[PDB]
Structure formats: C-alpha cells, structure tokens
Amino acid sequence: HHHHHHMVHITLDRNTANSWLIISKDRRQVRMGDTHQNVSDNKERFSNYPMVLGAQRFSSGKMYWEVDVTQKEAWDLGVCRDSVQRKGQFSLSPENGFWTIWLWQDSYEAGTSPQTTLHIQVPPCQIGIFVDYEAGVVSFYNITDHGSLIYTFSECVFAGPLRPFFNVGFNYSGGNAAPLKLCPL
Ligand SMILES: CS(=O)(=O)c1nccn1Cc1cscn1
C-alpha cells in the first residue's frame, strides 16, 4: 500500500483503560496485568474486557498507524466511535460503533455481524490500520507480508468522532501476556 505518509502518532488514554491494564510511561504500549492496577473507577473505563482507547479523536482526513502483536494469541484492533458503550457485555460490530479485526483460537476474523473469516497465509507480527473519514473506509494491512491487504470495511457510517481501539485479550492460557505496542513512524 501507499498510505504510510498519513502516519499519525497515537498514544493511549489511561482514563479509558480497563483497571487491570498496564500502560507504559510513553503511552505507546499496553499489557494485561495479573491483578487490579489500583486506579479509581470512572465512567470512561471499559469494565468487562481488557480494552483501551487512543487519546486522539478523528472527524476528517486520512490517518494511518501500526501496531505490534508479536507472540500474542488473542487481541482486537481497529477504531470505534467516541460514544461506544463502556460497561457490561457487547459485541464488536459496526452497529455498536466498532470497525475491528481480531485473532482468536489460531484464526483471524473481521468484526462484522456476523463475523467474517479472514484469509492470512503469513501470520502478522505488525498490523497497519488506515482510516479515510470522508470515504467511509477502514482498511487493515499485514506489515509482515509486504503490506498485503487483510480487510476493508467500506460504506462505513461512523456517525461521530473516531478513536483508535485496542483489546490486549485475556490471559487464561498463560500464553497471551505479551503487550500491544504502537510502532514508530
Ligand atoms: C457486566 S456482565 O455482562 O458481566 C454481567 N453482569 C451481570 C450479569 N452479567 C452477565 C454475565 C456474567 S458472566 C457472563 N455474562
């Protein structure tokens, strides 16, 4: 792809994080802690899943960033509306304000409703995410496989400002402790 020149510097918003997440000093990495991280509750925190938002809000333009997923077994990545539900159970779908892909149980899927099987021959260690606000597009790229296309959501109805979206996944297996990392420009 040729989207690299739209690179934006994303940082994580601590205030939105589930209370078990540990975000690095530079706000560029996040991992699952083994316990509650001793923060106060607030209405912004995702309560039921290991989720966090980027601090940046987008309402126009073209934006690109990259995320390192090395050695993870499960995660979700993409964008979401600023006003998505934070508390309780919900599915990741465009109807609920999410444009995402995930890894789960050795396969990759797009967060449509119902979900869509992805076709990935080279498991990615880094993911590229491209948003074209005006066009209504969210696309995902396999950086490990020379930038090959993973998935495009088109005809998106964002209906609000967008924020970068992350889920580090649970670590029931003991094999999913590795962080998500925002990769340098
Ligand atoms: C916030 S929540 O959705 O976890 C919830 N709070 C009360 C009941 N449930 C449902 C539940 C518990 S185990 C799986 N689903």
mmCIF file of C-alpha atoms and ligand atoms in Angstrom:
data_model
loop_
_atom_site.group_PDB
_atom_site.id
_atom_site.type_symbol
_atom_site.label_atom_id
_atom_site.label_comp_id
_atom_site.label_asym_id
_atom_site.label_seq_id
_atom_site.Cartn_x
_atom_site.Cartn_y
_atom_site.Cartn_z
ATOM 1 C CA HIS A 1 0.000 0.000 0.000
ATOM 2 C CA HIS A 2 0.979 3.724 -0.255
ATOM 3 C CA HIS A 3 -0.801 5.010 2.957
ATOM 4 C CA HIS A 4 2.404 5.430 5.059
ATOM 5 C CA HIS A 5 2.568 9.281 4.518
ATOM 6 C CA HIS A 6 -0.776 9.610 6.530
ATOM 7 C CA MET A 7 1.063 8.250 9.631
ATOM 8 C CA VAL A 8 -0.235 9.723 12.910
ATOM 9 C CA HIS A 9 1.418 9.425 16.363
ATOM 10 C CA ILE A 10 -1.111 7.557 18.556
ATOM 11 C CA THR A 11 -0.911 7.489 22.359
ATOM 12 C CA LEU A 12 -3.091 5.503 24.787
ATOM 13 C CA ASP A 13 -5.644 7.243 27.061
ATOM 14 C CA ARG A 14 -5.093 5.791 30.631
ATOM 15 C CA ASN A 15 -8.508 7.047 31.741
ATOM 16 C CA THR A 16 -10.350 4.713 29.276
ATOM 17 C CA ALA A 17 -8.319 1.604 30.178
ATOM 18 C CA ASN A 18 -9.761 -1.397 31.964
ATOM 19 C CA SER A 19 -8.457 -1.315 35.559
ATOM 20 C CA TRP A 20 -6.193 -4.409 35.001
ATOM 21 C CA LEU A 21 -4.184 -2.813 32.131
ATOM 22 C CA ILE A 22 -0.626 -1.513 32.495
ATOM 23 C CA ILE A 23 0.271 1.297 30.065
ATOM 24 C CA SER A 24 3.930 2.284 29.632
ATOM 25 C CA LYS A 25 5.301 5.736 30.603
ATOM 26 C CA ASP A 26 5.443 6.804 26.916
ATOM 27 C CA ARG A 27 1.719 5.717 26.484
ATOM 28 C CA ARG A 28 2.752 3.624 23.471
ATOM 29 C CA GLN A 29 2.467 0.079 24.966
ATOM 30 C CA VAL A 30 -0.224 -1.761 26.934
ATOM 31 C CA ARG A 31 -0.406 -5.202 28.536
ATOM 32 C CA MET A 32 -2.695 -7.238 30.806
ATOM 33 C CA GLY A 33 -1.664 -7.125 34.477
ATOM 34 C CA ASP A 34 -2.154 -10.145 36.778
ATOM 35 C CA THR A 35 -4.440 -8.040 39.151
ATOM 36 C CA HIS A 36 -6.367 -4.733 39.505
ATOM 37 C CA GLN A 37 -3.819 -1.897 38.941
ATOM 38 C CA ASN A 38 -5.036 0.250 41.895
ATOM 39 C CA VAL A 39 -6.794 3.004 39.847
ATOM 40 C CA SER A 40 -10.144 4.622 40.754
ATOM 41 C CA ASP A 41 -13.217 3.698 38.672
ATOM 42 C CA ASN A 42 -14.734 6.197 36.178
ATOM 43 C CA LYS A 43 -17.461 6.117 33.545
ATOM 44 C CA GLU A 44 -14.914 6.026 30.650
ATOM 45 C CA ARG A 45 -13.243 2.679 31.658
ATOM 46 C CA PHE A 46 -14.109 -0.477 29.758
ATOM 47 C CA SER A 47 -15.302 -2.690 32.657
ATOM 48 C CA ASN A 48 -15.816 -6.192 31.112
ATOM 49 C CA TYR A 49 -12.839 -6.591 28.688
ATOM 50 C CA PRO A 50 -9.126 -5.661 28.536
ATOM 51 C CA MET A 51 -9.799 -2.653 26.261
ATOM 52 C CA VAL A 52 -8.352 0.884 25.971
ATOM 53 C CA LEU A 53 -8.747 3.810 23.510
ATOM 54 C CA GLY A 54 -6.222 6.102 21.818
ATOM 55 C CA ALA A 55 -6.288 9.719 23.067
ATOM 56 C CA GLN A 56 -6.591 11.077 19.503
ATOM 57 C CA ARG A 57 -10.044 11.865 18.030
ATOM 58 C CA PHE A 58 -10.595 11.950 14.252
ATOM 59 C CA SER A 59 -13.536 13.666 12.475
ATOM 60 C CA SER A 60 -11.996 14.172 8.948
ATOM 61 C CA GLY A 61 -8.966 13.234 6.831
ATOM 62 C CA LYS A 62 -6.823 10.168 6.234
ATOM 63 C CA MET A 63 -4.968 8.519 9.142
ATOM 64 C CA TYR A 64 -2.555 5.558 9.335
ATOM 65 C CA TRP A 65 -0.843 3.774 12.265
ATOM 66 C CA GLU A 66 0.833 0.443 13.043
ATOM 67 C CA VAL A 67 0.531 -1.966 15.977
ATOM 68 C CA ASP A 68 2.930 -4.740 17.031
ATOM 69 C CA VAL A 69 1.122 -8.005 18.040
ATOM 70 C CA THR A 70 4.226 -10.275 18.337
ATOM 71 C CA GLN A 71 3.706 -13.503 20.368
ATOM 72 C CA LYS A 72 0.020 -12.792 21.162
ATOM 73 C CA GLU A 73 -2.703 -15.487 20.997
ATOM 74 C CA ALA A 74 -5.712 -13.115 21.138
ATOM 75 C CA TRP A 75 -6.379 -9.371 20.516
ATOM 76 C CA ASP A 76 -8.772 -6.979 18.806
ATOM 77 C CA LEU A 77 -7.665 -3.855 16.841
ATOM 78 C CA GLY A 78 -9.291 -1.057 14.876
ATOM 79 C CA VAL A 79 -11.332 2.106 15.511
ATOM 80 C CA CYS A 80 -14.503 2.953 17.270
ATOM 81 C CA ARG A 81 -16.914 5.791 17.852
ATOM 82 C CA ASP A 82 -16.091 8.042 20.790
ATOM 83 C CA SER A 83 -19.523 7.181 22.287
ATOM 84 C CA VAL A 84 -19.325 3.342 22.296
ATOM 85 C CA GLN A 85 -20.708 1.588 25.396
ATOM 86 C CA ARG A 86 -18.039 1.095 28.124
ATOM 87 C CA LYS A 87 -19.893 -1.049 30.744
ATOM 88 C CA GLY A 88 -21.230 -4.591 30.551
ATOM 89 C CA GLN A 89 -21.235 -7.059 27.654
ATOM 90 C CA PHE A 90 -21.380 -6.156 23.951
ATOM 91 C CA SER A 91 -20.236 -7.467 20.530
ATOM 92 C CA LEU A 92 -17.731 -5.660 18.316
ATOM 93 C CA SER A 93 -19.799 -4.677 15.252
ATOM 94 C CA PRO A 94 -20.391 -1.557 13.119
ATOM 95 C CA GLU A 95 -23.965 -1.440 14.549
ATOM 96 C CA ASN A 96 -22.317 -0.925 18.015
ATOM 97 C CA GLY A 97 -19.792 1.621 16.673
ATOM 98 C CA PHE A 98 -16.695 -0.643 16.073
ATOM 99 C CA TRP A 99 -14.603 -1.337 12.948
ATOM 100 C CA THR A 100 -12.190 -4.070 14.065
ATOM 101 C CA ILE A 101 -10.386 -7.324 13.254
ATOM 102 C CA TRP A 102 -9.171 -9.934 15.757
ATOM 103 C CA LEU A 103 -7.088 -13.031 16.376
ATOM 104 C CA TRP A 104 -8.794 -15.788 18.406
ATOM 105 C CA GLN A 105 -8.047 -19.561 18.631
ATOM 106 C CA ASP A 106 -5.498 -19.557 15.784
ATOM 107 C CA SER A 107 -7.807 -17.792 13.227
ATOM 108 C CA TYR A 108 -8.404 -14.183 12.147
ATOM 109 C CA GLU A 109 -11.837 -12.595 11.673
ATOM 110 C CA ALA A 110 -13.343 -9.201 10.845
ATOM 111 C CA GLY A 111 -15.848 -7.783 13.351
ATOM 112 C CA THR A 112 -18.850 -7.664 11.040
ATOM 113 C CA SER A 113 -22.208 -9.066 12.275
ATOM 114 C CA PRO A 114 -21.958 -11.940 11.888
ATOM 115 C CA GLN A 115 -18.129 -12.066 11.805
ATOM 116 C CA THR A 116 -16.215 -12.707 8.572
ATOM 117 C CA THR A 117 -13.382 -15.211 8.101
ATOM 118 C CA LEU A 118 -10.065 -13.646 7.081
ATOM 119 C CA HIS A 119 -7.508 -15.398 4.774
ATOM 120 C CA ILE A 120 -3.960 -14.883 6.146
ATOM 121 C CA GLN A 121 -1.115 -17.181 4.926
ATOM 122 C CA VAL A 122 1.646 -15.235 6.825
ATOM 123 C CA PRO A 123 0.560 -14.600 10.462
ATOM 124 C CA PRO A 124 1.244 -10.899 11.094
ATOM 125 C CA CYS A 125 3.627 -9.566 13.744
ATOM 126 C CA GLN A 126 2.586 -5.935 12.882
ATOM 127 C CA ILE A 127 -0.816 -4.630 11.605
ATOM 128 C CA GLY A 128 -1.331 -1.363 9.657
ATOM 129 C CA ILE A 129 -4.680 0.463 10.104
ATOM 130 C CA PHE A 130 -5.869 3.058 7.556
ATOM 131 C CA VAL A 131 -8.943 5.295 8.075
ATOM 132 C CA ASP A 132 -10.401 7.521 5.335
ATOM 133 C CA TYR A 133 -13.067 9.502 7.192
ATOM 134 C CA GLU A 134 -14.629 11.188 4.143
ATOM 135 C CA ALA A 135 -14.729 7.975 2.047
ATOM 136 C CA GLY A 136 -16.127 5.839 4.929
ATOM 137 C CA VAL A 137 -13.240 3.283 4.767
ATOM 138 C CA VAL A 138 -11.262 1.335 7.391
ATOM 139 C CA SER A 139 -8.566 -0.985 5.998
ATOM 140 C CA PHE A 140 -6.119 -3.399 7.653
ATOM 141 C CA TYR A 141 -2.687 -4.389 6.225
ATOM 142 C CA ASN A 142 -0.246 -7.244 7.022
ATOM 143 C CA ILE A 143 3.093 -5.419 7.530
ATOM 144 C CA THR A 144 4.970 -8.784 7.945
ATOM 145 C CA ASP A 145 3.760 -9.798 4.395
ATOM 146 C CA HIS A 146 4.920 -6.655 2.495
ATOM 147 C CA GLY A 147 1.743 -4.696 3.397
ATOM 148 C CA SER A 148 -0.778 -7.118 1.860
ATOM 149 C CA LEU A 149 -4.481 -6.291 2.397
ATOM 150 C CA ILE A 150 -6.243 -8.126 5.228
ATOM 151 C CA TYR A 151 -9.701 -6.500 5.175
ATOM 152 C CA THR A 152 -11.594 -3.366 4.058
ATOM 153 C CA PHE A 153 -14.754 -2.071 5.734
ATOM 154 C CA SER A 154 -16.408 0.208 3.134
ATOM 155 C CA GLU A 155 -19.670 2.202 3.251
ATOM 156 C CA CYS A 156 -18.854 2.866 6.932
ATOM 157 C CA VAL A 157 -21.323 5.050 8.851
ATOM 158 C CA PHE A 158 -19.002 6.420 11.552
ATOM 159 C CA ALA A 159 -21.728 8.787 12.941
ATOM 160 C CA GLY A 160 -19.317 10.552 15.295
ATOM 161 C CA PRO A 161 -15.678 11.213 16.066
ATOM 162 C CA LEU A 162 -13.441 8.093 15.887
ATOM 163 C CA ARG A 163 -10.810 6.845 18.344
ATOM 164 C CA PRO A 164 -8.141 4.176 17.934
ATOM 165 C CA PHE A 165 -9.357 0.961 19.636
ATOM 166 C CA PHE A 166 -7.306 -1.852 21.319
ATOM 167 C CA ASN A 167 -8.046 -5.098 23.194
ATOM 168 C CA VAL A 168 -4.989 -6.929 24.613
ATOM 169 C CA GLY A 169 -7.159 -10.031 25.283
ATOM 170 C CA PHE A 170 -7.451 -12.174 28.398
ATOM 171 C CA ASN A 171 -4.567 -14.374 29.524
ATOM 172 C CA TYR A 172 -6.396 -17.507 30.804
ATOM 173 C CA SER A 173 -3.878 -19.688 28.866
ATOM 174 C CA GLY A 174 -0.647 -18.147 30.244
ATOM 175 C CA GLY A 175 0.402 -17.672 26.571
ATOM 176 C CA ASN A 176 -1.127 -14.204 25.900
ATOM 177 C CA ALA A 177 0.821 -11.924 28.298
ATOM 178 C CA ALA A 178 2.717 -10.057 25.544
ATOM 179 C CA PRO A 179 1.870 -6.361 25.016
ATOM 180 C CA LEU A 180 0.316 -4.424 22.121
ATOM 181 C CA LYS A 181 2.853 -1.771 21.035
ATOM 182 C CA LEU A 182 2.353 1.279 18.805
ATOM 183 C CA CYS A 183 5.256 1.107 16.286
ATOM 184 C CA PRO A 184 7.424 4.128 15.469
ATOM 185 C CA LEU A 185 6.922 6.186 12.262
HETATM 186 C C1 LIG B 1 -21.394 -6.948 33.194
HETATM 187 S S1 LIG B 1 -21.674 -8.610 32.739
HETATM 188 O O1 LIG B 1 -22.267 -8.616 31.440
HETATM 189 O O2 LIG B 1 -20.513 -9.411 33.016
HETATM 190 C C2 LIG B 1 -22.928 -9.174 33.803
HETATM 191 N N1 LIG B 1 -23.258 -8.528 34.932
HETATM 192 C C3 LIG B 1 -24.252 -9.297 35.488
HETATM 193 C C4 LIG B 1 -24.525 -10.373 34.715
HETATM 194 N N2 LIG B 1 -23.671 -10.333 33.636
HETATM 195 C C5 LIG B 1 -23.733 -11.312 32.551
HETATM 196 C C6 LIG B 1 -22.602 -12.287 32.520
HETATM 197 C C7 LIG B 1 -21.858 -12.704 33.560
HETATM 198 S S2 LIG B 1 -20.784 -13.944 33.115
HETATM 199 C C8 LIG B 1 -21.226 -13.609 31.505
HETATM 200 N N3 LIG B 1 -22.266 -12.848 31.379
#
